[PDB]
PDB file of C-alpha atoms in Angstrom:
ATOM      1  CA  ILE A   1     -36.417  17.518  -8.962  1.00 45.82           C
ATOM      2  CA  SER A   2     -38.160  16.220 -12.102  1.00 45.33           C
ATOM      3  CA  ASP A   3     -34.745  16.138 -14.140  1.00 45.47           C
ATOM      4  CA  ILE A   4     -32.434  15.715 -11.163  1.00 41.75           C
ATOM      5  CA  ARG A   5     -34.918  12.272  -9.972  1.00 44.82           C
ATOM      6  CA  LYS A   6     -34.660  11.153 -13.135  1.00 45.68           C
ATOM      7  CA  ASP A   7     -31.099  11.765 -13.757  1.00 47.05           C
ATOM      8  CA  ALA A   8     -30.734   9.707 -10.185  1.00 47.80           C
ATOM      9  CA  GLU A   9     -32.889   6.981 -11.794  1.00 43.73           C
ATOM     10  CA  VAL A  10     -30.643   6.516 -14.803  1.00 39.30           C
ATOM     11  CA  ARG A  11     -27.541   6.785 -12.774  1.00 40.10           C
ATOM     12  CA  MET A  12     -28.554   4.310 -10.457  1.00 38.71           C
ATOM     13  CA  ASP A  13     -29.844   1.780 -13.233  1.00 39.40           C
ATOM     14  CA  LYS A  14     -26.606   2.160 -14.671  1.00 41.55           C
ATOM     15  CA  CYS A  15     -24.722   0.883 -11.334  1.00 39.66           C
ATOM     16  CA  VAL A  16     -27.299  -1.751 -11.137  1.00 35.80           C
ATOM     17  CA  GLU A  17     -26.613  -3.284 -14.506  1.00 36.44           C
ATOM     18  CA  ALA A  18     -22.743  -2.348 -13.988  1.00 37.22           C
ATOM     19  CA  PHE A  19     -22.867  -4.815 -11.140  1.00 35.34           C
ATOM     20  CA  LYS A  20     -24.732  -7.847 -12.913  1.00 33.87           C
ATOM     21  CA  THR A  21     -22.376  -7.525 -15.713  1.00 35.15           C
ATOM     22  CA  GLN A  22     -19.264  -8.194 -12.925  1.00 34.71           C
ATOM     23  CA  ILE A  23     -21.050 -10.637 -11.503  1.00 34.24           C
ATOM     24  CA  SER A  24     -21.602 -12.828 -15.196  1.00 32.79           C
ATOM     25  CA  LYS A  25     -17.468 -12.688 -15.084  1.00 35.40           C
ATOM     26  CA  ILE A  26     -17.271 -15.007 -12.369  1.00 35.88           C
ATOM     27  CA  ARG A  27     -17.494 -18.569 -13.739  1.00 34.71           C
ATOM     28  CA  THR A  28     -19.682 -20.773 -11.588  1.00 34.03           C
ATOM     29  CA  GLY A  29     -20.273 -24.786 -11.852  1.00 34.22           C
ATOM     30  CA  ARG A  30     -23.511 -24.349 -14.773  1.00 36.44           C
ATOM     31  CA  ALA A  31     -22.811 -23.659 -18.390  1.00 37.19           C
ATOM     32  CA  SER A  32     -23.172 -19.745 -18.923  1.00 36.87           C
ATOM     33  CA  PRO A  33     -22.506 -18.520 -22.332  1.00 36.67           C
ATOM     34  CA  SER A  34     -22.762 -15.037 -20.737  1.00 37.57           C
ATOM     35  CA  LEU A  35     -19.415 -15.693 -18.994  1.00 40.98           C
ATOM     36  CA  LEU A  36     -17.345 -15.165 -22.352  1.00 42.17           C
ATOM     37  CA  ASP A  37     -18.828 -11.804 -23.161  1.00 44.19           C
ATOM     38  CA  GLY A  38     -15.462 -10.169 -22.788  1.00 43.50           C
ATOM     39  CA  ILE A  39     -13.374 -13.130 -24.667  1.00 38.56           C
ATOM     40  CA  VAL A  40     -11.641 -10.905 -27.705  1.00 37.33           C
ATOM     41  CA  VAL A  41      -9.254 -12.463 -29.883  1.00 37.21           C
ATOM     42  CA  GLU A  42      -6.854 -10.500 -32.544  1.00 36.98           C
ATOM     43  CA  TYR A  43      -8.535 -10.627 -36.037  1.00 36.78           C
ATOM     44  CA  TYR A  44      -6.166  -9.896 -38.673  1.00 40.01           C
ATOM     45  CA  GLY A  45      -4.458  -7.376 -36.356  1.00 38.95           C
ATOM     46  CA  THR A  46      -7.521  -6.048 -34.998  1.00 38.26           C
ATOM     47  CA  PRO A  47      -8.687  -6.565 -31.236  1.00 36.26           C
ATOM     48  CA  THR A  48     -11.923  -8.359 -32.035  1.00 37.01           C
ATOM     49  CA  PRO A  49     -14.949  -9.696 -29.582  1.00 37.48           C
ATOM     50  CA  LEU A  50     -15.645 -13.200 -29.253  1.00 33.47           C
ATOM     51  CA  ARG A  51     -19.397 -12.798 -30.565  1.00 31.94           C
ATOM     52  CA  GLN A  52     -17.660 -11.853 -33.880  1.00 31.46           C
ATOM     53  CA  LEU A  53     -16.053 -14.951 -34.585  1.00 27.91           C
ATOM     54  CA  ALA A  54     -17.997 -18.072 -32.861  1.00 28.17           C
ATOM     55  CA  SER A  55     -21.247 -18.800 -31.353  1.00 29.52           C
ATOM     56  CA  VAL A  56     -21.312 -19.261 -27.639  1.00 30.16           C
ATOM     57  CA  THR A  57     -24.012 -22.098 -27.074  1.00 32.70           C
ATOM     58  CA  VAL A  58     -24.831 -24.819 -24.145  1.00 33.11           C
ATOM     59  CA  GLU A  59     -24.514 -28.282 -25.033  1.00 37.13           C
ATOM     60  CA  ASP A  60     -24.567 -29.425 -21.386  1.00 33.86           C
ATOM     61  CA  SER A  61     -25.891 -28.100 -18.147  1.00 32.26           C
ATOM     62  CA  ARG A  62     -21.865 -27.945 -17.143  1.00 36.69           C
ATOM     63  CA  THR A  63     -20.315 -27.841 -20.801  1.00 35.67           C
ATOM     64  CA  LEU A  64     -20.317 -24.965 -23.227  1.00 35.85           C
ATOM     65  CA  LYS A  65     -19.754 -25.063 -26.951  1.00 35.29           C
ATOM     66  CA  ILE A  66     -18.066 -22.853 -29.156  1.00 32.68           C
ATOM     67  CA  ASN A  67     -18.613 -22.528 -33.230  1.00 32.88           C
ATOM     68  CA  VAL A  68     -15.897 -20.305 -34.974  1.00 28.99           C
ATOM     69  CA  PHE A  69     -16.713 -19.205 -38.246  1.00 30.59           C
ATOM     70  CA  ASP A  70     -13.807 -19.061 -39.315  1.00 32.35           C
ATOM     71  CA  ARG A  71     -12.019 -22.672 -38.886  1.00 30.78           C
ATOM     72  CA  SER A  72      -8.686 -20.601 -39.012  1.00 29.53           C
ATOM     73  CA  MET A  73      -9.344 -18.712 -36.043  1.00 29.39           C
ATOM     74  CA  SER A  74     -10.061 -21.795 -33.954  1.00 32.38           C
ATOM     75  CA  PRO A  75      -6.390 -21.726 -32.294  1.00 33.05           C
ATOM     76  CA  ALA A  76      -6.698 -18.104 -31.232  1.00 35.49           C
ATOM     77  CA  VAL A  77      -9.986 -18.155 -29.557  1.00 39.13           C
ATOM     78  CA  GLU A  78      -9.161 -21.544 -27.460  1.00 41.66           C
ATOM     79  CA  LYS A  79      -6.045 -19.456 -26.726  1.00 37.79           C
ATOM     80  CA  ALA A  80      -7.800 -16.681 -25.957  1.00 38.84           C
ATOM     81  CA  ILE A  81     -10.102 -18.687 -23.438  1.00 39.61           C
ATOM     82  CA  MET A  82      -7.166 -20.465 -21.744  1.00 37.72           C
ATOM     83  CA  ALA A  83      -5.119 -17.089 -21.057  1.00 39.08           C
ATOM     84  CA  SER A  84      -8.351 -15.518 -19.657  1.00 40.08           C
ATOM     85  CA  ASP A  85      -8.938 -18.761 -17.154  1.00 41.41           C
ATOM     86  CA  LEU A  86      -6.587 -21.071 -15.871  1.00 41.31           C
ATOM     87  CA  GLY A  87      -9.193 -23.219 -15.007  1.00 42.37           C
ATOM     88  CA  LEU A  88     -10.514 -23.871 -18.513  1.00 43.18           C
ATOM     89  CA  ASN A  89      -9.316 -26.835 -20.654  1.00 44.09           C
ATOM     90  CA  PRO A  90     -11.214 -26.702 -23.667  1.00 42.69           C
ATOM     91  CA  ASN A  91     -11.230 -29.227 -26.373  1.00 46.68           C
ATOM     92  CA  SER A  92     -11.276 -28.663 -30.183  1.00 51.17           C
ATOM     93  CA  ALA A  93     -12.284 -30.873 -33.438  1.00 52.23           C
ATOM     94  CA  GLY A  94     -12.857 -28.970 -36.425  1.00 53.52           C
ATOM     95  CA  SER A  95     -14.664 -25.581 -36.044  1.00 50.26           C
ATOM     96  CA  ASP A  96     -16.366 -26.288 -32.370  1.00 47.21           C
ATOM     97  CA  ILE A  97     -14.819 -25.837 -29.091  1.00 46.77           C
ATOM     98  CA  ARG A  98     -15.817 -27.989 -26.447  1.00 48.48           C
ATOM     99  CA  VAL A  99     -15.790 -25.731 -22.947  1.00 44.79           C
ATOM    100  CA  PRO A 100     -16.438 -28.149 -19.778  1.00 41.50           C
ATOM    101  CA  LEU A 101     -17.427 -26.264 -16.785  1.00 40.66           C
ATOM    102  CA  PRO A 102     -14.933 -27.632 -13.703  1.00 44.21           C
ATOM    103  CA  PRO A 103     -17.643 -28.575 -10.500  1.00 47.60           C
ATOM    104  CA  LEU A 104     -16.367 -26.120  -8.072  1.00 50.14           C
ATOM    105  CA  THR A 105     -15.321 -27.082  -4.463  1.00 52.55           C
ATOM    106  CA  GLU A 106     -16.909 -26.508  -0.850  1.00 54.40           C
ATOM    107  CA  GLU A 107     -14.190 -24.126  -0.730  1.00 49.95           C
ATOM    108  CA  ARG A 108     -14.503 -22.548  -3.931  1.00 48.91           C
ATOM    109  CA  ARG A 109     -17.888 -21.816  -3.656  1.00 50.66           C
ATOM    110  CA  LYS A 110     -17.319 -20.058  -0.388  1.00 50.38           C
ATOM    111  CA  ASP A 111     -14.387 -18.011  -1.758  1.00 50.37           C
ATOM    112  CA  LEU A 112     -16.729 -16.965  -4.872  1.00 50.73           C
ATOM    113  CA  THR A 113     -19.302 -16.154  -2.557  1.00 49.81           C
ATOM    114  CA  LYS A 114     -17.374 -14.022  -0.369  1.00 51.81           C
ATOM    115  CA  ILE A 115     -16.428 -11.883  -3.915  1.00 49.22           C
ATOM    116  CA  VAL A 116     -19.973 -11.895  -5.119  1.00 46.46           C
ATOM    117  CA  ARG A 117     -21.223 -10.237  -1.836  1.00 48.56           C
ATOM    118  CA  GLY A 118     -18.282  -7.690  -1.619  1.00 48.01           C
ATOM    119  CA  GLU A 119     -19.144  -6.701  -5.633  1.00 46.44           C
ATOM    120  CA  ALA A 120     -22.858  -6.072  -4.178  1.00 47.96           C
ATOM    121  CA  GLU A 121     -21.791  -3.822  -1.322  1.00 52.73           C
ATOM    122  CA  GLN A 122     -19.832  -1.794  -3.524  1.00 51.28           C
ATOM    123  CA  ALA A 123     -22.488  -1.633  -5.527  1.00 51.04           C
ATOM    124  CA  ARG A 124     -25.407  -0.817  -3.188  1.00 53.30           C
ATOM    125  CA  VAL A 125     -22.440   2.008  -2.172  1.00 52.34           C
ATOM    126  CA  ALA A 126     -22.457   3.690  -5.559  1.00 51.15           C
ATOM    127  CA  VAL A 127     -26.509   3.729  -5.764  1.00 50.86           C
ATOM    128  CA  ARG A 128     -26.717   5.387  -2.410  1.00 50.26           C
ATOM    129  CA  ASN A 129     -24.071   7.862  -3.183  1.00 50.33           C
ATOM    130  CA  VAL A 130     -25.992   8.638  -6.860  1.00 52.65           C
ATOM    131  CA  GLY A 131     -28.744   9.067  -4.432  1.00 52.20           C
ATOM    132  CA  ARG A 132     -27.079  11.349  -1.851  1.00 48.67           C
ATOM    133  CA  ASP A 133     -25.641  13.403  -4.795  1.00 49.27           C
ATOM    134  CA  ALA A 134     -28.907  14.276  -5.983  1.00 49.68           C
ATOM    135  CA  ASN A 135     -30.157  15.054  -2.407  1.00 49.85           C
ATOM    136  CA  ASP A 136     -27.149  17.517  -2.310  1.00 47.54           C
ATOM    137  CA  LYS A 137     -28.710  19.353  -5.451  1.00 49.32           C
ATOM    138  CA  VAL A 138     -32.044  19.376  -4.145  1.00 52.07           C
ATOM    139  CA  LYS A 139     -30.647  20.912  -0.806  1.00 48.80           C
ATOM    140  CA  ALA A 140     -29.083  23.320  -2.836  1.00 51.42           C
ATOM    141  CA  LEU A 141     -32.203  24.551  -4.489  1.00 53.62           C
ATOM    142  CA  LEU A 142     -33.765  24.918  -1.004  1.00 50.88           C
ATOM    143  CA  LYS A 143     -30.865  26.780   0.213  1.00 51.66           C
ATOM    144  CA  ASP A 144     -31.996  29.582  -2.312  1.00 51.17           C
ATOM    145  CA  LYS A 145     -35.787  30.091  -2.949  1.00 50.98           C
ATOM    146  CA  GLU A 146     -36.862  28.111  -5.969  1.00 46.50           C
ATOM    147  CA  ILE A 147     -37.912  25.026  -3.552  1.00 46.30           C
ATOM    148  CA  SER A 148     -39.667  25.150  -0.457  1.00 49.32           C
ATOM    149  CA  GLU A 149     -39.041  22.662   2.737  1.00 47.75           C
ATOM    150  CA  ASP A 150     -42.138  20.273   1.357  1.00 47.31           C
ATOM    151  CA  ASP A 151     -40.719  19.788  -1.720  1.00 48.21           C
ATOM    152  CA  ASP A 152     -37.232  18.762  -0.584  1.00 47.14           C
ATOM    153  CA  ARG A 153     -38.682  16.512   2.089  1.00 47.92           C
ATOM    154  CA  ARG A 154     -40.845  14.992  -1.052  1.00 47.81           C
ATOM    155  CA  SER A 155     -37.665  14.561  -3.016  1.00 47.60           C
ATOM    156  CA  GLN A 156     -35.817  13.299  -0.153  1.00 48.24           C
ATOM    157  CA  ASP A 157     -38.399  10.637   0.304  1.00 46.33           C
ATOM    158  CA  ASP A 158     -38.678  10.010  -3.661  1.00 45.07           C
ATOM    159  CA  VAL A 159     -34.854   9.661  -3.750  1.00 46.60           C
ATOM    160  CA  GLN A 160     -34.668   7.213  -0.862  1.00 44.92           C
ATOM    161  CA  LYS A 161     -37.620   5.017  -2.989  1.00 43.92           C
ATOM    162  CA  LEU A 162     -35.145   4.604  -6.344  1.00 48.66           C
ATOM    163  CA  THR A 163     -32.570   3.889  -3.764  1.00 46.80           C
ATOM    164  CA  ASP A 164     -34.609   0.590  -2.015  1.00 47.17           C
ATOM    165  CA  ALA A 165     -35.924  -0.117  -5.481  1.00 47.96           C
ATOM    166  CA  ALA A 166     -32.447  -0.357  -6.888  1.00 48.62           C
ATOM    167  CA  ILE A 167     -30.486  -1.887  -3.996  1.00 48.73           C
ATOM    168  CA  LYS A 168     -33.538  -4.623  -4.315  1.00 48.10           C
ATOM    169  CA  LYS A 169     -32.293  -5.580  -7.766  1.00 50.88           C
ATOM    170  CA  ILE A 170     -28.737  -5.908  -6.804  1.00 49.09           C
ATOM    171  CA  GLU A 171     -29.862  -8.074  -3.547  1.00 43.41           C
ATOM    172  CA  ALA A 172     -32.214 -10.264  -6.174  1.00 44.34           C
ATOM    173  CA  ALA A 173     -28.861 -10.428  -8.629  1.00 47.54           C
ATOM    174  CA  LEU A 174     -26.820 -11.262  -5.540  1.00 47.16           C
ATOM    175  CA  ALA A 175     -29.345 -13.654  -3.936  1.00 46.13           C
ATOM    176  CA  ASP A 176     -29.345 -15.678  -7.539  1.00 46.25           C
ATOM    177  CA  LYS A 177     -25.646 -16.065  -8.128  1.00 48.72           C
ATOM    178  CA  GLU A 178     -25.611 -17.482  -4.793  1.00 51.40           C
ATOM    179  CA  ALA A 179     -27.877 -19.815  -5.472  1.00 51.35           C
ATOM    180  CA  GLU A 180     -25.974 -20.946  -8.601  1.00 51.41           C
ATOM    181  CA  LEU A 181     -22.892 -20.810  -7.215  1.00 51.82           C
ATOM    182  CA  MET A 182     -23.827 -23.945  -4.078  1.00 53.32           C
ATOM    183  CA  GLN A 183     -25.986 -25.525  -6.575  1.00 53.98           C
ATOM    184  CA  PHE A 184     -23.071 -26.599  -8.550  1.00 52.71           C
TER     185      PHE A 184
END
């Protein structure tokens, strides 16, 4: 009911956000600083996130810029970026690292579009499964006595709404990602 529903909404939300996070790891044709969010570099023997040693910004619509705090940490940062994508050929001068985004081919756009559409369906299925389990919990209460057949039917509706609402956020994120792929 109340708790169950909220629990379902919070869980569905976690899935929607999980979809957007994995969608941001896909490199497109436009400079997107959020793509290097997962980069990690060994700092004094400790695995450290990129954001803690440098600053990723946009200098061009097709080029990224990574300013490393510790200049000595430049080679490692540039190496950690190359080891994560064979398509990235950066260029450093001092504490800066220029990272141009290679324009996608029509075949790559298609290939990348399929992958995003696949993660979306998986994200959509996760949201339904979250709703399905919330319903199974309510059905259990109805099987007892606490809940009437009216409460249960209402819960199913509310849960159905939560699913459609979350699935909408996934289709919107998907659509946006698709647009970026075909546009550049």
